[PDB]
Amino acid sequence: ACTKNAIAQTGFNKDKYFNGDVWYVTDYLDLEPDDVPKRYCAALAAGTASGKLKEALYHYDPKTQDTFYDVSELQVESLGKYTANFKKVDKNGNVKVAVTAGNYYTFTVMYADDSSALIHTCVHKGNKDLGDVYAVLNRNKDAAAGDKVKSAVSAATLEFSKFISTKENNCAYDNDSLKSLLTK
Numbered sequence: 001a002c003t004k005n006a007i008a009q010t011g012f013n014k015d016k017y018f019n020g021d022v023w024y025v026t027d028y029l030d031l032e033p034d035d036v037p038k039r040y041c042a043a044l045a046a047g048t049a050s051g052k053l054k055e056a057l058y059h060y061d062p063k064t065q066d067t068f069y070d071v072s073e074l075q076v077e078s079l080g081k082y083t084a085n086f087k088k089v090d091k092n093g094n095v096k097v098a099v100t101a102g103n104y105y106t107f108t109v110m111y112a113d114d115s116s117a118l119i120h121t122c123v124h125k126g127n128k129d130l131g132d133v134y135a136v137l138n139r140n141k142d143a144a145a146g147d148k149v150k151s152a153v154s155a156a157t158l159e160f161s162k163f164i165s166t167k168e169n170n171c172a173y174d175n176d177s178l179k180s181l182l183t184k
């Protein structure tokens with residue numbers, strides 16, 4: 001279950017964030033115990049495609065090899081806060097699981113600059129009961145979190161020391177498929 005109304009960044013620059021490029025998750029914080037694996041790889045691309053706000057997601061469990069992509073058209077709740085009915089797709093955008101009512105996530109951009117971001121997401125997926133997940137993003141998949149984003153974690157009244165790193169999982173990403181999925 002989700003419990004947080006995350007506050008969007010003051011002055012959030014949507015066109016910079018949603019520029020069609022890839023963001024890598026470098027660190028995350030799951031508020032529910034035992035909710036997701038400790039070891040994981042995730043990335044996304046975010047952009048406008050033929051006038052529509054879109055996100056493409058990639059998840060990979062480096063131990064099980066469980067892999068999945070998603071694409072969504074984002075709807076706007078307020079600047080920096082979005083809702084999105086996700087469809088699971090293959091890497092080429094072919095639909096594996098259609099959009100369904102009740103399958104959606106919310107997405108709040110709590111901090112962003114050109115190279116780093118802090119987001120909150122609340123995923124709703126039928127009968128599961130996932131909780132709040134915060135993620136530190138970087139444009140560079142290997143970047144250690146810098147002072148701007150770490151300060152934003154503190155300003156959200158969170159402890160960066162509790163975030164789990166994705167860096168020791170040998171994560172490798174198909175950047176091309178994330179970018180192309182934005183159109184699908």
Ligand code: HEM
Binds near residue numbers: 042059086104119
């Ligand atoms: C930008 C950050 C993220 C977003 C927006 C996001 C969103 C989602 C969405 C929409 C799904 C359901 C997809 C589908 O069924 O088609 C999902 C599933 C999942 N995510 Fe994430 N995710 C993010 C990061 C992470 C991270 C960092 C982890 C680390 C463990 C993670 C673990 C999982 C797991 C284990 C599932 C499968 C849940 C299940 O079906 O039992 N996610 N995520």
